[PDB]
Design an enzyme around this catalytic site. Structure first.
Site, short mmCIF file in Angstrom:
data_model
loop_
_atom_site.label_atom_id
_atom_site.label_comp_id
_atom_site.label_asym_id
_atom_site.label_seq_id
_atom_site.Cartn_x
_atom_site.Cartn_y
_atom_site.Cartn_z
N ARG A 290 0.82 -1.21 0.00
CA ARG A 290 0.00 0.00 0.00
C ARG A 290 0.85 1.26 0.00
O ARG A 290 0.43 2.29 -0.54
CB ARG A 290 -0.95 0.00 1.20
CG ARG A 290 -2.17 -0.89 1.05
CD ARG A 290 -2.95 -0.94 2.36
NE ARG A 290 -4.30 -1.48 2.21
CZ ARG A 290 -4.61 -2.77 2.25
NH1 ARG A 290 -3.68 -3.69 2.39
NH2 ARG A 290 -5.88 -3.13 2.15
N1 LIG Z 1 -9.58 2.00 -7.41
C1 LIG Z 1 -8.49 1.25 -7.26
N2 LIG Z 1 -7.56 1.27 -8.24
C2 LIG Z 1 -6.46 0.52 -8.10
N3 LIG Z 1 -6.12 -0.28 -7.09
C3 LIG Z 1 -7.06 -0.28 -6.14
C4 LIG Z 1 -8.24 0.44 -6.14
N4 LIG Z 1 -8.97 0.20 -4.99
C5 LIG Z 1 -8.23 -0.65 -4.32
N5 LIG Z 1 -7.06 -0.98 -4.96
C6 LIG Z 1 -6.01 -1.90 -4.48
O1 LIG Z 1 -6.47 -2.55 -3.32
C7 LIG Z 1 -5.69 -2.13 -2.17
C8 LIG Z 1 -6.59 -1.98 -0.98
O2 LIG Z 1 -6.99 -0.62 -0.83
P1 LIG Z 1 -8.01 -0.12 0.31
O3 LIG Z 1 -7.22 0.32 1.48
O4 LIG Z 1 -8.92 0.87 -0.30
O5 LIG Z 1 -8.86 -1.41 0.70
P2 LIG Z 1 -9.90 -1.61 1.91
O6 LIG Z 1 -11.11 -2.33 1.46
O7 LIG Z 1 -10.09 -0.33 2.63
O8 LIG Z 1 -9.10 -2.62 2.85
P3 LIG Z 1 -8.80 -2.58 4.45
O9 LIG Z 1 -9.76 -3.59 5.02
O10 LIG Z 1 -7.36 -3.01 4.52
O11 LIG Z 1 -9.06 -1.17 4.92
C9 LIG Z 1 -4.98 -0.87 -2.63
O12 LIG Z 1 -3.81 -0.60 -1.89
C10 LIG Z 1 -4.72 -1.17 -4.10
O13 LIG Z 1 -3.64 -2.08 -4.23
#
Ligand SMILES: Nc1ncnc2c1ncn2[C@@H]1O[C@H](COP(=O)(O)OP(=O)(O)OP(=O)(O)O)[C@@H](O)[C@H]1O
Ligand SMILES: Nc1ncnc2c1ncn2[C@@H]1O[C@H](COP(=O)(O)OP(=O)(O)OP(=O)(O)O)[C@@H](O)[C@H]1O
Ligand SMILES: [Mg+2]
Ligand SMILES: [Mg+2]
Lengths: 53, 504, 465, 75
Positions: free
Chosen positions: B367
């Site tokens: 990340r």
């Molecule tokens: N719109 C996007 N474009 C590209 N990669 C993305 C996108 N959304 C998510 N990712 C990928 O997925 C990863 C997870 O991102 P994110 O922190 O938004 O997930 P999350 O659902 O909030 O997970 P957590 O439970 O860890 O908070 C990012 O670091 C990236 O690698």
């Protein structure tokens, strides 16, 4: 490295031997006059802790 | 000599007898001792049992005090004397723990003597808030080509090493510890990194072999090993990640940088589930307690990069999670993925095929990303990430592609060289200049004529020629911090000269 | 009056009072603590003993320690003085910028607005995200949920919503960090001070930050969403503003409630949850609504445990939301970002009389092709593409083109992807999917439809190949 | 400033051990058979580990070197 490990091995067996020798000598050397002196010191130390307040 | 040491240890170990507020064991069983007394005891305060075992006051109740025993509960009987230590649960911290193997309480277990630490730190300290932290911008050099290029780790980051059993999770973590010798031997203290290896639920023979590996490679001089093996009690395996984190938080709060490895947090969750079920707490998903997320979240959040007003130190966490048949959708791995800043996924299928380390490139996330890697590595690994993605898309056409286009064949040929490029032997981490040069050669097309079965031999010989005959190229790269087109032309010429000299 | 600590078990503290018991939800202050430790009364146990939930750590608490009754619930600062500031669950400023000097305070426990104070108007909130704007459009004033597992992308999606909607917004914003990464809170805070949304120099700030993160005890994590509500409720009611409320993420409120409920002596509910899961969630979620005094557009990231949508905490959250956006791990593993499930996201404004006939028909046409693709995928998986010659292969070819065209590069994801972020007007979105549905782009490769916003960039990418 | 009598007794037992050990020429004092077996096991292991059977490790090792091999002029 051979002399260091030989010294360490001799140090370890001498430490073990002196530990069991001290334990046996301390346990076998019990005298009633010294026991009463230690009892009096324990009472005085208990009295000193009561004063310290 | 030995008599003098024995005499000064007797004289130095004064009893210092005084009256202590004490309690009495009511009932002992299932790792929980109920103690009558201790009116002025604090919550989570460490206690001492009459047998020498320590314990943590978990439940304060009107009539009794529930105490979590840090040991085997066969040493505690009903009616024993429980003494207050007067302090909340804490471990020794400092630079006196470097080179020492300790248990979860900080007591040495390697038989090298006592620890002369003058400071102690609580294991339940809250994590730093929003303000004292800052963005992660300093690289964490694991020495692995596939890690430092495709899943780059920074200082202050939490990177999960997740996979099945026997997939190289410990191999990645240990090589990252060994790799820091080149920075710790140098005089640049800002790149120095101390290491804390926490072994939770492992075999004690495995920990001993790890310590032997660190001692042979001279990586033990800056490493602390906190060991709570499979024979230890569940409270010891529960406490050990927090004990090691406190030892690593000493370096973080004093301007230094520390790396910590929890191997593994899946076994700590099993130990905590045992403690929760023996405390009659309501089981949830896979019989885990509801606070098994907070178990890892309060631990990993203490790994942070501090601001310059807090000394500028950092703590880097590498938690390990073992999956079952490659199931990252299970309860415990999904919790840790939602905590950490990206995961490194290790595949059983790639491990069976001889690909070591068996890192899944498409399923490995960082990340932080490119914000914490050098300009030379970032410039080259960006191209390799695109080319590996291109090879991944056209990999389905290689199954039946008896006749295939020249562009697709070039993508397949480049991806094979790049896949063979990321392979690396165990216990041989690479310097970042060696990683940049090897990845650059494979990504510019220098290996399109070299067979994929001879890439590893080419990796040794060509780097040796650079380290011997063309050291001016490395000096220009180190001065510039990147790769110039003039240096690109020079590297093109010396590659052509080297391949022609090897064979013609 | 004055009480004394009787029992400390985790985040739950039992306090016995002598003269008069504090009411339930009252705030209690522990005396011998160098930082403020706040206990919130949860129940009366009898014998003049109340059972409380601590808002901070309970280590170092002894039995018999004096506890003071504040005579009121947890009151936090509210108003323009909270804009540009970061506060914790109990309203203390954690941005190291001094105290929050204000004359206005409000209890974090309030009754939800009544049935009379309800607004029935629904207007589409254009985002710039093609999958959101087409299939599950957001209402301008309404409750939006972002369901997803770990790593499927919810923080990225909610940061893109802040980048698109909250930057050009005539009103105030509130962010409630509930049990998430403190690194993400530091990243968002510096993103605001760099984008000018938070002004450290003057009083032109437009967002208030409330942060209780995953390092906090379960009492703080189960009440910090209420603190973000109370700031947003003041802006809606006492100022008539249109407020944006971003909560990341609301599952941690429910999860922290289950952790406390184990120590409250309750018989556990299904999957080990609290018995009061739906009632505690309903009390919290009904306060987040648009009334006749003002409007609140709420976007709530919702974590699903073990990628299970049948888990009681996401399942009860589904009925509280106007528009739902379900993020799938299978779509994310295909490289399609944002990984919104097209056949699991609803809007409640996907109506011909609200968004138009052509917008509705294109959205239903897209979902029909994707549902036909899912029905055919079992034949494709085992047997192969040899099915129905022209007809089913055209269905597969169009559906795969639609699946690529639902993906879009985000401006907030531009750092780790390299693709420039695209903000796509909704007219270009419905025009782009109408061209794919009409068969006007069957000759283009499906790679050209991937990770490009407008349909003109699809044909430009196809010409580049 | 009175010292603990047990500490004084422990110091006397250390001095008594040291006097008897120096009167025994550094040998163990009333050692059991298992301590003697432990000492012989450690000495035998160190002899087998460092190869003390072939050469005397206490003295300087007697090197038996040889002239380095030089390849012929042609192939
Ligand atoms: N719109 C996007 N474009 C590209 N990669 C993305 C996108 N959304 C998510 N990712 C990928 O997925 C990863 C997870 O991102 P994110 O922190 O938004 O997930 P999350 O659902 O909030 O997970 P957590 O439970 O860890 O908070 C990012 O670091 C990236 O690698
Ligand atoms: N890059 C590599 N090159 C060669 N051997 C390797 C490599 N990586 C791992 N191995 C070997 O593979 C085996 C398994 O790796 P390792 O023990 O590190 O995995 P693990 O995930 O820690 O397994 P465990 O379940 O025992 O913890 C070991 O014998 C190790 O030496
Ligand atoms: Mg391992
Ligand atoms: Mg998130």
């Amino acid at each position: 490295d051979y002399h260091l490990e030989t010294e360490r091995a001799q140090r370890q067996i001498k430490q073990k031997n002196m530990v069991d020798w001290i334990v046996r000598n301390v346990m076998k050397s019990i005298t009633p006059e010294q026991e009463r002196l230690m009892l009096s010191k324990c009472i005085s130390d208990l009295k000193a802790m009561s004063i310290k307040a | 000599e030995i008599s003098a040491v024995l005499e000064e240890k007797i004289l130095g170990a004064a009893p210092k007898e005084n009256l202590e507020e004490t309690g009495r064991v009511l009932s002992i069983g299932d790792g929980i001792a109920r103690v009558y007394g201790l009116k002025n005891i604090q919550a989570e305060e460490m206690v001492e049992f009459s047998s020498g075992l320590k314990g943590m006051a978990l439940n304060l109740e009107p009539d009794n005090v529930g105490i979590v025993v840090f040991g085997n509960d066969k040493h505690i009987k009903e009616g024993d004397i429980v003494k207050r230590t007067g302090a909340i649960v804490d471990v020794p911290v400092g630079e006196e723990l470097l080179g020492r193997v300790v248990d979860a309480l900080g007591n040495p277990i390697d038989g090298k003597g006592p620890i002369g630490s003058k400071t102690r730190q609580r294991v339940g300290v809250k994590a730093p808030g929003i303000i004292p932290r800052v963005s992660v911008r300093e690289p964490m050099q694991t020495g692995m080509k596939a890690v430092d290029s495709l899943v780059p780790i920074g200082r202050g980051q939490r990177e999960l090493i997740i996979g099945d059993r026997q997939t190289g999770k410990t191999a990645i973590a240990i090589d990252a510890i060994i790799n820091q010798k080149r920075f710790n031997d140098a005089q640049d203290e800002k790149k120095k990194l101390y290491c804390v290896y926490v072994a939770i639920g492992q075999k004690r023979s495995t920990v001993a072999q790890i310590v032997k590996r660190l001692t042979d490679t001279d990586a033990m001089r800056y490493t602390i090993v906190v060991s709570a093996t499979a024979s230890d009690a569940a409270p010891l395996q529960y406490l050990a990640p927090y004990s090691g984190c406190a030892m690593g938080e000493f370096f973080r709060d004093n301007g230094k940088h520390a790396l910590i490895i929890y191997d593994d947090l899946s076994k700590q969750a099993v130990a905590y589930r045992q403690m929760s079920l023996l405390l009659r707490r309501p089981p949830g998903r896979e019989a885990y307690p509801g606070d098994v997320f907070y178990l890892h979240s309060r631990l990993l959040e203490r790994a942070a990069k501090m601001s310059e007003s807090n000394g500028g130190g950092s703590l880097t966490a590498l938690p390990v999670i073992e999956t079952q048949a490659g199931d990252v959708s299970a309860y415990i791995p999904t919790n840790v993925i939602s905590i950490t800043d990206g995961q490194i996924f290790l595949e059983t299928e790639l491990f069976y095929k001889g690909i070591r380390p068996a890192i899944n490139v498409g399923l490995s996330v960082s990340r932080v990303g490119s914000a914490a890697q050098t300009r030379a590595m970032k410039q080259v690994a960006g191209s390799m990430k695109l080319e590996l993605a291109q090879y991944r898309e056209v990999a389905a056409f290689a199954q039946f592609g008896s006749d295939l286009d020249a562009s697709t064949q070039q993508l397949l040929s480049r991806g094979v060289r790049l896949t063979e490029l990321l392979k690396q032997g165990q216990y041989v981490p690479m310097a970042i200049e060696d990683q940049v040069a090897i990845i650059y050669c494979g990504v510019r097309g220098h290996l399109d004529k070299v067979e994929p079965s001879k890439i590893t031999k080419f990796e040794k010989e060509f780097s040796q020629h650079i380290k011997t005959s063309h050291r001016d190229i490395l000096d220009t790269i180190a001065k510039e911090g990147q790769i110039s087109p003039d240096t690109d032309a020079k590297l093109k010429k010396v590659v052509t000269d080297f391949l022609s000299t090897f064979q013609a | 009056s004055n009480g004394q600590i009787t029992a400390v078990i985790g985040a739950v503290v039992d306090v016995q009072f002598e003269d008069q018991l504090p009411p339930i939800l009252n705030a209690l202050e522990v005396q011998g603590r160098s930082p403020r430790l706040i206990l919130e009364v949860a129940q009366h146990l009898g014998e003049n003993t109340v059972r409380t939930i601590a808002m901070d750590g309970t280590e170092g608490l002894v039995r018999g320690q004096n506890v003071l009754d504040t005579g009121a619930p947890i009151k936090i600062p509210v108003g323009p003085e909270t804009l540009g500031r970061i506060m914790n669950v109990i309203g203390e400023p954690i941005d190291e910028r001094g105290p929050i000097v204000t004359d206005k305070f409000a209890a974090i426990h309030a009754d939800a607005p009544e049935f009379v104070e309800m607004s029935v108007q629904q207007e589409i909130l254009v985002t710039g995200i093609k999958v959101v704007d087409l299939l599950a459009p957001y209402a301008k004033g309404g409750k939006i949920g972002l369901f997803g597992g770990a790593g499927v992308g919810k923080t990225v999606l909610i940061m893109e919503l802040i980048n698109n909607v909250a930057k050009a917004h005539g009103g105030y914003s509130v962010f409630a960090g509930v049990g998430e990464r403190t690194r993400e809170g530091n990243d968002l805070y510096h993103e605001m001070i760099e984008s000018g949304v938070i002004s450290l120099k003057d009083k032109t700030s437009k967002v208030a930050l409330v942060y209780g993160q995953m390092n906090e005890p379960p009492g703080a994590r189960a009440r910090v969403a209420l603190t973000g509500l109370t700031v947003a409720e003041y802006f809606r009611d006492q100022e008539g503003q249109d407020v944006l409320l971003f909560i990341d993420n609301i599952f941690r409120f429910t999860q922290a409630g289950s952790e406390v409920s184990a120590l409250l002596g309750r018989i556990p509910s299904a999957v080990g949850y609290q018995p009061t899961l739906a009632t505690d969630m309903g009390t919290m979620q009904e306060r987040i609504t648009t009334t006749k005094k003002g409007s609140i557009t709420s976007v709530q990231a919702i974590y699903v445990p073990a990628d299970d949508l049948t888990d009681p905490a996401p399942a009860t959250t589904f009925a509280h939301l106007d528009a739902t956006t379900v993020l799938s791990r299978a779509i994310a593993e295909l490289g399609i970002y944002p990984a919104v499930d097209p056949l699991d996201s609803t809007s409640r404004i996907l109506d011909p009389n609200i968004i138009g006939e052509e917008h509705y028909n294109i959205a239903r046409g897209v979902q029909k092709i994707l549902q036909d693709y899912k029905s055919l995928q079992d034949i494709i998986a085992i047997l192969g593409m040899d099915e129905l010659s022209e007809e089913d292969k055209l269905i597969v070819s169009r559906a795969r083109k639609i699946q690529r065209f639902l993906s879009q590069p985000f401006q907030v994801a531009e750092v780790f992807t390299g693709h420039a972020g695209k903000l796509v007007p909704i007219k270009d979105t419905i025009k782009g999917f109408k061209m794919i549905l009409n068969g006007e782009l069957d000759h283009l490769p499906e790679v050209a439809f991937y990770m490009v916003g407008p349909i003109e960039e699809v044909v430009a990418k196809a010409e580049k190949i | 400033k009175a010292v603990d009598p047990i500490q004084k007794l422990f110091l006397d037992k250390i001095k008594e051990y040291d006097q008897k050990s120096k009167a025994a020429g550094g040998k163990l004092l009333e050692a059991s058979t298992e301590i003697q077996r432990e000492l012989d096991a450690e000495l035998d292991k160190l002899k087998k580990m460092y190869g003390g059977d072939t050469a005397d490790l206490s003295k300087f090792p007697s090197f038996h070197f040889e002239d380095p091999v030089v390849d012929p002029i042609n192939m």
